[PDB]
Every structure is written in structure tokens, then in C-alpha cells.
Design a protein around this ligand. Structure first.
Ligand SMILES: CC(=O)N[C@H]1[C@H]([C@H](O)[C@H](O)CO)O[C@@](O[C@H]2[C@@H](O)[C@@H](CO)O[C@@H](O[C@H]3[C@H](O)[C@@H](O)[C@H](O)O[C@@H]3CO)[C@@H]2O)(C(=O)O)C[C@@H]1O
Ligand SMILES: CC(=O)N[C@H]1[C@H]([C@H](O)[C@H](O)CO)O[C@@](O[C@H]2[C@@H](O)[C@@H](CO)O[C@@H](O[C@H]3[C@H](O)[C@@H](O)[C@H](O)O[C@@H]3CO)[C@@H]2O)(C(=O)O)C[C@@H]1O
Lengths: 160, 160
């Protein structure tokens, strides 16, 4: 009944600490002012957006792989191996209806993470690890990212 | 547990019908890619954002008035007089921390509307009229709008 809006500018390769943690019922949107579907190969990821716990855990890892023409969703505890990785085929098909810019939205449904690309829901990822998101990262493969060098992030917390 | 993201482009003087209504717990954000605090005089509104019911009622009317250096919040049923109007003093003060662009967010707390300019909450408006938002309008006074000619609107519905 007293929500909050937080805006962050995330440079590729950076990680920002949220001034307000993202928990169940809260939202996180990533804004890209560019879209490059014919950028190049990722090592292996061209672009990755991560929601991380205060322990360094990867609550949610989102990776776009142009050469493998896929999107990967996974998670993992700090200094531990990668877990069960879901995947969505065909990158470009999710960005249909873009036009030089993209929006990725993550809904934290407590026990799941709903990921939306613009207006299209791509997956209802089931949380392999639980907790509140206290920081986010935007990692890219040198010069072959599908998003702008700077990605804006708006978080809507205090909902439920 | 199955929310939706809808993106609308609203041209000044236009009104769009939402593909999904905005109800209690839902969110609506307005994106302006320009900010003009020394634009001119409004007749009397330089810029107005409205959330309208399916009956044409003005659930929430938001008006920026440079010359009167104020922001007005009000409501009204169709073909009825304007109601009790709240107001926030000093426009520019709410946009501090902008930099050529702005975003307004309206949280529908069921019995209230929380309005946020960027990251600053400006008012906790109490609904004089209740209902679901089925459409939004962006009205301007000829050439003196504080926002770009086209404002982007992203709605987040199906939350609660
Ligand atoms: C040079 C190197 O090996 N570093 C990797 C890193 C590290 O493995 C680690 O994640 C560092 O934190 O991973 C990078 O992305 C990985 C990530 O996309 C996961 C998704 O779950 O997949 C990894 O590759 C998988 C592959 O998808 C599977 O098909 C295969 O069974 O196992 C592979 C190894 O786990 C990605 O490597 C990262 O930068 O975060 C890529 C780096 O090259
Ligand atoms: C030419 C004309 O009179 N049209 C007005 C319209 C109409 O009054 C009506 O709203 C059309 O739908 O109103 C415009 O904005 C009004 C709006 O900002 C409301 C806010 O509640 O205030 C009106 O002026 C008030 C003033 O703020 C009060 O101090 C005063 O006590 O009463 C005034 C009259 O209600 C605004 O006119 C609109 O375009 O929507 C302005 C048009 O000029």
C-alpha cells in the first residue's frame, strides 16, 4: 500500500546493488535501447541478465545465445555448479514486435519467475533457489551483445 | 500468478483503449523521452495524463501547469463537474534527477492511487470515483507540453 520505484543504469559487465530488494510479487524490467540479432557469437552468451541473492547466488540467469539460437534460464549457488537449465528456442521470434529496442520483464511470483519479452511471456521458470534479489548484473561477450552497452532497469517493489 | 505486460504508444491528443484493464494492484507507467520545464503556458494544462473508466469517467486526471507552477489531481464522472482537486506545488522539484526524460507511475492501491514521478512519490491520492481503468489519454496544450509528442505506456496487470 506504499510501493516504490527504483531506476538503475547498468553498464555491460557491471553489477548494481538494489536500494530495495526484489521479493515475491515485485517486478523488474530491463530496458534496452538497441536490438542486434545479427551481432555475432557469444562465449557462449552474447548477453546475460542475472538476479542475484545477497549470498551471491544466481537466483535467475538469463542468457541469449545467437550462435546457438537459444535463450537459457538457470540458477546456481555461489561457487557451486550450474543447475537444471531450461531453454527457449529461437531468439528473434521473441523480439518480434520490437523495432530497435527491447524490454525484458521478470515477475517474482514467489515460487516462480515469469519472464516476459516485450508483451510475450517466454517461460514460467520454477525457482531452483529461493530468496530475495538484492543485486543484478548485465554481462556480455565483447562487442556481440544484443542489447545496448547500457541497459536501464526499473524495479517495482512493495506490491504484495 | 500469470501477469501481463502491455505496451502502448500514446500520441498527444490521443486516447487508447487498454487491451487489459488496470485494476486494484495493477501498475501503469508513463514514459516521456523529453522534459521541458520552460515550455510555456497551459490552457490551463500544459500536459494531462488521464485514467478513464469504461463509462468515460475520469478515474484520475493528472495535470501539469507550468505557469501556475503546480500539478493537479482530480476526478469526475462523464458530463458532470470537476470534483475535489488535490495539488502538489512546484513542478520542477518533482523532476529533479531527470535529465531529458521522465516517467510517471500510478499504482492502483484499490482504494487509492499512488503517483510516482521517477523515484519520488508525489501524492497518495484517494479515489473519489472507483472502478477499473479501461483507457488512457494524453492531452496537451498546443506546443507547450512538458513531455515528448509521443508518450510510452507500459501496464502491468494480473498482479494481485
Ligand atoms: C570460461 C568459462 O567456462 N566460464 C563460463 C561461465 C562459468 O561456467 C560460470 O558460469 C561462471 O560464473 O558460464 C558462462 O555461462 C554459462 C551459463 O550460461 C550456463 C547456463 O546454465 O551454461 C554454461 O554452459 C553450459 C551449457 O549451457 C550446457 O549445455 C552444458 O551442459 O554445460 C555448460 C557448462 O556449464 C555457460 O558457460 C558465464 O559467463 O556465466 C559462460 C562462461 O564461458
Ligand atoms: C475550455 C474549458 O473550459 N475546458 C477546460 C476543461 C473542462 O473544464 C473539462 O475538464 C473538459 O473535460 O478542463 C481542462 O482542465 C481542467 C482540469 O485541469 C481541472 C482539474 O480538476 O481544473 C480545471 O480548472 C479548474 C481550476 O483548476 C480550479 O482552480 C477552479 O476552481 O475551477 C476550474 C474549472 O474546473 C481545468 O480547466 C481540460 O482541458 O481538461 C482545461 C480546459 O480549458
Amino acid at each position: 500500500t506504499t510501493s516504490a520505484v527504483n531506476i538503475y543504469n547498468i553498464s555491460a559487465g557491471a553489477s548494481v546493488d538494489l536500494a530495495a530488494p526484489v521479493t515475491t510479487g515485485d517486478i523488474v524490467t530491463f530496458f534496452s535501447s538497441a536490438l542486434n540479432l545479427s551481432a555475432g557469437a557469444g562465449s557462449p552468451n552474447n548477453t546475460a541478465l542475472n538476479l542475484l541473492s545477497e549470498n551471491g547466488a544466481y537466483l535467475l540467469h538469463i542468457a541469449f545465445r545467437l550462435q546457438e539460437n537459444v535463450i537459457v534460464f538457470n540458477s546456481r549457488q555461489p561457487n557451486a555448479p550450474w543447475l537444471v537449465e531450461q531453454r527457449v528456442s529461437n531468439v528473434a521470434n521473441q523480439f518480434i514486435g520490437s523495432g530497435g529496442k527491447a524490454m525484458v520483464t521478470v515477475f517474482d511470483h514467489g515460487d516462480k519467475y515469469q519472464v516476459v519479452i516485450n508483451e510475450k511471456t517466454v517461460i514460467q521458470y520454477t525457482k531452483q533457489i529461493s530468496g530475495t534479489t538484492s543485486s543484478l548484473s548485465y554481462n556480455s561477450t565483447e562487442g556481440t551483445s544484443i542489447f545496448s552497452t547500457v541497459v536501464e532497469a526499473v524495479t517495482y517493489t512493495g506490491l504484495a
